Structure formats: structure tokens, C-alpha cells
């Protein structure tokens, strides 16, 4: 089997991407944030605290003939941006782009933090990291990909995120029309439950490539590119007037700037992030200070190849017995 679904930016900055997901019988379509950095599929639901719902589409398991309470199961998760959610668990039929999983754990939110309530465009998350990170207790549950894997033509999924434009998540096949050149594959460590890999270095703009190992995760659920402070300082030093603002919470730059590109290494290959991808716009409405799309990972504890990086590539998440990651230009 295969699946193919379009993923769409939630706003003009590509702060996140939503992908339609069919849950239950008859189908209830919710727009979920596909997240290769977590492993829970959770949704706003009829069980969510009413004051914490503001415009989201909810899953109502009582209206699904295939929903079943997973008795005794609860879940609770915190994300890198400080947001959180928790609740109980149903199993139900879940389809993504024509690919169906029966018996998928659908984690129903009883509580969500303010960041979720305040974003009316995201109805939940669909985790695509390794199932070892799933938070369901007392019986850990498998991700949608893990459940689908054995039925897939090939045990892979791909992320093809757009810059200010829709893109595609495919399951079970590699669309050879979706990228240019060749795909370069690189080793993954699953030891922390992430799609963790080592970039071979970087360049700033038209500058020379610096060979250096940068361990990080491929994370579709993180907006920005978080890298070591040395790297990030070298990037922003090339933008006149750029500075790190403790008050804003990262590097800002004059909105009048033309940003240089940033290149990262995948083995002997190179992925070039155009400068425009690194512009996240005014820090507040009407400001001439703009927020940078490359930020320091110092104090995160891990480097994160988030959307800013991934959208510059066609990315293969190869879930074979020994997983790997593939990157191509596009």
C-alpha cells in the first residue's frame, strides 16, 4: 500500500504545516501537525476542556462506530516549546492520503496548553518519530508509521515541505519526480527516539564550506533551524545590524536586509537554504526588526533541523530495520 497527502502551511510564515487525516467511521477529518520529533497521535476532542477549545475541529469518538476506549490508558506530553497536552486513549481507524491503519491509538486530549488553544488551525499532532518515545501508559502505543510499515510497498515516508506553498507527505514510496539529482542517505541513531543524524558541516552564503560534524534531529514539528552557537554567530555576522536579543528570545535582524543562504552537508552532498527561507518577519506587527530563522541550540540540549532546513530538501525517512535519512535537492 501507499499514501499521499498534501501538507499546507498554517500561515504566511510557514510556522507549521497541517495535513488532513481521516479518523473514525464515518470519517472525521482533522488537520494534524505531522511531527517527526514526537511519537503521539493526539487530537482535540469532545473530551477537551471546553475553555481550551477555540476554533479547532474536534474528534468525537462516540460518533465513530469503530472507536473503542483503550481501557486504563492515559497520555501526557511536553514539547520543546514548553507546550503540553494530556488525556485518554481510543483505538480507531486512521487514514492518511488513502493509506489506512486499523486499531491506531488516537490520543484524546482532555487538557491542552495555551499555545494549542490559541492556534485554531492545528487540530492535533501526528507523531512520526520512533515509537519508543510514545507517552501512553501503562501500555506504550505505536505511531501511525510503525503500524502501517509492514503493509507499505517500502518501509519509508517522505517529507516534501514547501516554502510559502503546499507540499507533500508520502508513505510507502519515493516519488522520483519530486527531487533533482540524487538522494544522499546518511546514518541514523535511534538511541534518543529521534531521526538523529550527523551533518558534515556548513557554509554561509557564498563562503567556503566548513567541515565539521553536527549531530541533530530531523524534526518537521519544529519551525526553525537550531544549531550550535558558533555556527549561528558565523551566519548572523554576515547580516549588517543582526544581533541576539535576550528580550526577543533570539537573533533579530533589520527587515531591510538581504539574507545570505545557509548550506548544510549531508555526507558529500550539500543542501542550500535560500536566504528568504530564514526570514520570519517582524517581531511584532509594524516592527522593522525581523526574527531570524536560524537560532542557537544552546540550552535546548540538541541541534534541530526543523522546517527551515527540511523545506529546502526532499527528505526520506527510511524505516528499514536499520533506519537511515535521505536528502535531495529539489
From Swiss-Prot:
Q: Name one GO biological process term.
A: proteolysis
Q: Which residues form the Peptidase A1 domain?
A: 17-328
Instruction: Name the domain of life.
Output: Eukaryota
Cysteines paired by S-S bonds: 255-290
Q: Which reaction does it catalyse?
A: Hydrolysis of proteins with specificity similar to that of pepsin A, prefers hydrophobic residues at P1 and P1', but does not cleave 14-Ala-|-Leu-15 in the B chain of insulin or Z-Glu-Tyr. Clots milk
Q: Does the keyword Protease apply?
A: yes
Instruction: Give the annotated active site.
Output: 35, 199
Keyword annotations: Aspartyl protease, Disulfide bond, Hydrolase, Protease, Signal, Zymogen
Q: What is its EC number?
A: 3.4.23.22
Q: Name one GO molecular function term.
A: aspartic-type endopeptidase activity
Q: Which family does it belong to?
A: Belongs to the peptidase A1 family.
Annotated protein name in UniProt? Endothiapepsin
List the source organism. Answer: Cryphonectria parasitica (Chestnut blight fungus)
Instruction: Specify the taxonomic lineage.
Output: Eukaryota, Fungi, Dikarya, Ascomycota, Pezizomycotina
The range of the complete sequence contained here reads 90 to 419 of 419
Amino acid at each position: 500500500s501507499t499514501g499521499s497527502a498534501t501538507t499546507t502551511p498554517i500561515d504566511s510564515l510557514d510556522d507549521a504545516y497541517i495535513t488532513p487525516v481521516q479518523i473514525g467511521t464515518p470519517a472525521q477529518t482533522l488537520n494534524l501537525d505531522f511531527d517527526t520529533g514526537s511519537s503521539d497521535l493526539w487530537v482535540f476532542s469532545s473530551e477537551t476542556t471546553a475553555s481550551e477549545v477555540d476554533g479547532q475541529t474536534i474528534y468525537t469518538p462516540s460518533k465513530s462506530t469503530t472507536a473503542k476506549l483503550l481501557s486504563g490508558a492515559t497520555w501526557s506530553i511536553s514539547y520543546g516549546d514548553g507546550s503540553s497536552s494530556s488525556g485518554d486513549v481510543y483505538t480507531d481507524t486512521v487514514s492518511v492520503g488513502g493509506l489506512t491503519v486499523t486499531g491506531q491509538a488516537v490520543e484524546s486530549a482532555k487538557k491542552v496548553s495555551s499555545s494549542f488553544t490559541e492556534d485554531s488551525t492545528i487540530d492535533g499532532l501526528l507523531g512520526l518519530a520512533f515509537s519508543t518515545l510514545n507517552t501512553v501508559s501503562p501500555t506504550q502505543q505505536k505511531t501511525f508509521f510503525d503500524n502501517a510499515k509492514a503493509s507499505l510497498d517500502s518501509p519509508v515516508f517522505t517529507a516534501d515541505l514547501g516554502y510559502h506553498a503546499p507540499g507533500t507527505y508520502n508513505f510507502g514510496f519515493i516519488d522520483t519526480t519530486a527531487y533533482t539529482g540524487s538522494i544522499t542517505y546518511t546514518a541514523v541513531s535511534t538511541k534518543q527516539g529521534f531521526w538523529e543524524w550527523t551533518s558534515t558541516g556548513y557554509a554561509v552564503g557564498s563562503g567556503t564550506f566548513k567541515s565539521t560534524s553536527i549531530d541533530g534531529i530531523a524534526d518537521t514539528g519544529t519551525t526553525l533551524l537550531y544549531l550550535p552557537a558558533t555556527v549561528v554567530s558565523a551566519y548572523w555576522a554576515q547580516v549588517s545590524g543582526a544581533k541576539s536579543s535576550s528580550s526577543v528570545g533570539g537573533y533579530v535582524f533589520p527587515c531591510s536586509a538581504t539574507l545570505p543562504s545557509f548550506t548544510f552537508g549531508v555526507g558529500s552532498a550539500r543542501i542550500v537554504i535560500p536566504g528568504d527561507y530564514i526570514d520570519f518577519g517582524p517581531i511584532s506587527t509594524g516592527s522593522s526588526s525581523c526574527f531570524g530563522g536560524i537560532q542557537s541550540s544552546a540550552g535546548i540540549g540538541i541541534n534541530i533541523f526543523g522546517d527551515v532546513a527540511l523545506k529546502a530538501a526532499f527528505v526520506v525517512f527510511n524505516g528499514a530495520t536499520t533506519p537511515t535519512l535521505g536528502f535531495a535537492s529539489k
